[PDB]
Amino acid sequence: PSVFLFPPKPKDTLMISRTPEVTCVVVDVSHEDPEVKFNWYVDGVEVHNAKTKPREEQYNSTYRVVSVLTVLHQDWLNGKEYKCKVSNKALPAPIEKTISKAKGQPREPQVYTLPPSREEMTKNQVSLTCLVKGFYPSDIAVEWRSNGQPENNYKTTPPVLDSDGSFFLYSKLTVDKSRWQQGNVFSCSVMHEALHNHYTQKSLSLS
Amino acid sequence: PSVFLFPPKPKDTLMISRTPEVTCVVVDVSHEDPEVKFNWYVDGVEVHNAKTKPREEQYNSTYRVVSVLTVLHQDWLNGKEYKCKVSNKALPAPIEKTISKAKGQPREPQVYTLPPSREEMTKNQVSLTCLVKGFYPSDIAVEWRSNGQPENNYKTTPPVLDSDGSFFLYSKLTVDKSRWQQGNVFSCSVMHEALHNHYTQKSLSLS
Amino acid sequence: FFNDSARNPETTNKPIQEASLQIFNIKDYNLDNLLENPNKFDDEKYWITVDTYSAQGERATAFSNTLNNITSKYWRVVFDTKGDRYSSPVVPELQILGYPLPNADTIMKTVTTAKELSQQKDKFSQKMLDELKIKEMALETSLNSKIFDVTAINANAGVLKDCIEKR
């Protein structure tokens, strides 16, 4: 049996209204003895508020017992060690897995909105860019919104390691040229632990 | 023993002067019987021109036998199945792994250079951006160069899957504001199989 | 108000160390300033602290305390754990308890003004000043009655309403 502990979504840990989860998947679980007892610790403080997720509809082959744990934002951001101790009857002794936030001096993300290229103006659609650099750790979330209304058609690149040691990423908002030329507002909404209320915006419009 | 077949570098397969390699790593190799016989096939045509790489430094524990194969560009671009058949004495029967180029209609990368942000002009350094979108497959390479001289300080994001089905990526060239304001030329040099000579450039300068 | 230990006994959240229930200073400032601009109005100066808390003891499920018959419909409350970076307050529920009473603001304005008139020594004869106190204590009795009859409060308020003359 193999264990796979996973961290919470950046967006969840940087917004108190949302609820972050520390998932502990267990694959290749014994078909003979499928009993799995999860024990959850947070710096030794064993918690008992976990929730085993229902056995999803895998066709055959291997049992995959997931176990979720709802976590406090502060506990994650402070960087407490969440430990998932899996216990199987087939297993001679329990498998432990530990995870925590990236350990290092946090840095503020410099957010910059870039307009469509001079060449791309010929095309019927345009690409609004949002550069986000000089931030640490990689835990970050970005969103677009046009005139308050959250945007649908955009994509964000993974955090890429910069030369100095910080990370960076871009986010491409694909919109029609009509809405750009007409003069709407589009706002890149970055979210990082080293910001005011873990939040900041940069607007973008035609000039 | 686990086998890990890897494709060639995009830059190597798109330049005939460079030589592409199809690496076949083998990890968790038997400590008792460390003999590994690699067999290499290309659509059944067994080739015998491979080279087992010397055991790199390594930090003890588990043997990691790498095996490289030099390949023809045309054979990769045509999309021939390179198969790595690992054979160990401890292993009851040989492990095979197969790899090929991404199968689908190739698409031309639309290259667009974007200048530094209006806000970033206050900073002592600036970030020259190069958007590259609407291309397939993900096999692509990008480079900057200022006044002919290849650039050092830049980073390129991984190919990200776009909404339509194509990929895209950005490339951030970090330079001093002096060289930008003075009025140098910086050229984003994209390289993709669906281009003229697998190559195209877009220059960027102050206005 | 409750601590997180109320909701989850075995919680890791730090309890509220100090808190302050407050009411809006309706007498001084304008009400429509708070409605339009609620951000600006978020300082201790603009509100009136009716009761405070200071956890000078062991941890508890909740803190509760009586209040002196308040009406002010707009409230402010603050919660401080004092636990350094990332020490968010957790209050499962905040209870402001009382009784339903139509025009509770008008009724209590009658009592507070009736006290101010009895302060005026050289205003009216003792014969009418004594009539004030008997009408005011009648109402205040029905306010702090164990059984809360609203009709009795409305009656004594109506008696004391037109009793105020002014000069």
DSSP state of A151: P
List C-alpha distances in Å: C83 to C13, C17, C87.
Answer: 10, 9, 5
B82 Cβ contact partners less than 8 Å away, ≥ 6 residues apart: B5, B22, B40, B41, B42, B69, B71, B98, B99, B100
Give the count of beta carbons closer than 10 Å to the beta carbon of residue B76. Answer: 23
Q: Are residues A84 and A113 in the same domain?
A: no
Domain boundary residue among A100, A130, A153? A100
Q: Are residues B153 and B81 in the same domain?
A: no
Q: Which chains touch C (3 or more CB pairs under 8 A)?
A: A
Given phi > 0 = left and psi -120 to 50 = alpha, else beta, which region is C84? Answer: left
Return the residue of A nearest to C88 by Cα: A74
Q: Which of A32, A35, A204, A55 is nearest to A127 (CA)?
A: A204
CA distance B81 to B73: 13
Give the count of beta carbons closer than 10 Å to the beta carbon of residue A72. Answer: 21
Strand order in the sheet with C47-54: C47-54, C18-24, C75-80
CA distance A168 to A159: 5
Burial of A96 (0-12, 13-18, 19+ CB in 10 A): middle
Domains identified in chain A, total number: 2
Q: How far is C87 from chain A (nearest CA, A)?
A: 7
Q: Are residues A93 and A129 in the same domain?
A: no
List C-alpha distances in Å: B8 to A160, B43, B52, B72.
Answer: 22, 17, 16, 11
Q: Are residues B74 and B109 in the same domain?
A: no
Residue A85 and residue A41 in contact, taking contact as beta carbons nearer than 8 Å:
yes
Domain boundary residue among A54, A78, A100? A100
Q: Are residues A95 and A185 in the same domain?
A: no
How many CA within 13 A on the CB side of residue A140? 34
Residue A94 and residue A40 in contact, taking contact as beta carbons nearer than 8 Å:
no
Chain A residues within 8 A of C8 when measuring between CB atoms:
49
CA distance C89 to C77: 12
Note whether B157 contacts A162, CB cutoff 8 Å. Answer: no
Q: Which of B163, B156, B165, B113 is nearest to A154 (CA)?
A: B163
CA distance B69 to B85: 12
Q: Are strands B63-68 and B51-52 parallel, antiparallel or unpaired?
A: antiparallel
Q: How far is C10 from chain A (nearest CA, A)?
A: 8
State which approach was used to obtain the coordinates.
X-ray
Q: Are residues B116 and B81 in the same domain?
A: no
CA distance C128 to C120: 12
Alpha-carbon torsion B187, B191, B195, B199, what sign? Answer: positive
Q: Are residues B71 and B166 in the same domain?
A: no
Burial of A186 (0-12, 13-18, 19+ CB in 10 A): buried
Long-range CB pairs of B177-181, under 8 A, 24+ apart, other chains included = B177/B121, B177/B123, B177/B124, B177/B125, B177/B126, B179/B146, B180/B116, B180/B126, B180/B128, B180/B206, B181/B206
CA dihedral of residues C60, C62, C63, C66 (deg, nearest 10): -140
Q: State whether residue B16 is helix, strand or coil.
A: coil
Q: Which helix (H) or strand (E) holds B74?
A: helix B73-78
Token pair belonging to A144: 């677009």
Q: Are residues A91 and A130 in the same domain?
A: no
Q: Are residues B58 and B82 in the same domain?
A: yes
Instruction: Look up residue B57 and give its amino acid.
Output: E
Chain B residues 98-117 with a CB less than 8 Å from chain A:
110, 112-117
CA distance B168 to B170: 7
CA distance B70 to B49: 8
Domain boundary residue among A100, A133, A161? A100
Asked if A16 has any chain C CB less than 8 Å from its own CB, the reply is yes
Instruction: Look up residue B175 and give its amino acid.
Output: V
Place of tokens 């690699």: B38
List C-alpha distances in Å: B165 to A125, B139, B192.
Answer: 16, 14, 17
Long-range CB pairs of A154-159, under 8 A, 24+ apart, other chains included = A155/B160, A155/B161, A155/B162, A155/B163, A155/B168, A156/B160, A157/B157, A157/B158, A157/B160, A157/B169, A157/B170, A158/B157, A158/B158, A158/B160, A159/A135
Return the residue of A nearest to C87 by Cα: A74
C44 Cβ contact partners less than 8 Å away, ≥ 6 residues apart: C20, C22
- Among A108, A110, A131, A140, the strongest candidate for a mutation testing the B interface, having the largest count of B CBs within 10 A, is A131
Q: What resolution (Å)?
A: 3.5
Residue B20 and residue B8 in contact, taking contact as beta carbons nearer than 8 Å:
yes
User: C104-119 and C150-161 helices cross at what angle (nearest 10)?
Assistant: 50
Note whether A48 contacts C12, CB cutoff 8 Å. Answer: no
Nearest to A45 among C12, C13, C85 (CB): C12
Question: What's the distance, Cα to Cα, between the start and end of chain B in Å?
Answer: 59
Chain B residues within 8 A of A133 when measuring between CB atoms:
127, 172
Q: Are residues B71 and B138 in the same domain?
A: no
DSSP state of C26: T
Q: Are residues A132 and A41 in the same domain?
A: no
CA dihedral of residues C67, C68, C69, C73 (deg, nearest 10): -60
Q: How far is A89 from chain C (nearest CA, A)?
A: 29
Instruction: Look up residue C88 and give its amino acid.
Output: S
Using alpha carbons only, give the angle C88, C91, C92 rounded to the nearest 5 degrees: 130
Phi and psi at B20, nearest 5°, equal: -80, 150
Q: State whether residue A178 is helix, strand or coil.
A: helix
Which range marks the domain in which residue B36 is found? 1-100
C148 Cβ contact partners less than 8 Å away, ≥ 6 residues apart: C99
Note whether A162 contacts B169, CB cutoff 8 Å. Answer: no
Place of tokens 């694959």: A27
Q: How far is CA C63 from the centre of its chain?
A: 16
User: C104-119 and C126-143 helices cross at what angle (nearest 10)?
Assistant: 150
Q: Which helix (H) or strand (E) holds B11?
A: helix B10-13
Q: Are residues B13 and B38 in the same domain?
A: yes
Q: How far is A153 from chain B (nearest CA, A)?
A: 7
Instruction: Look up residue C36 and give its amino acid.
Output: E
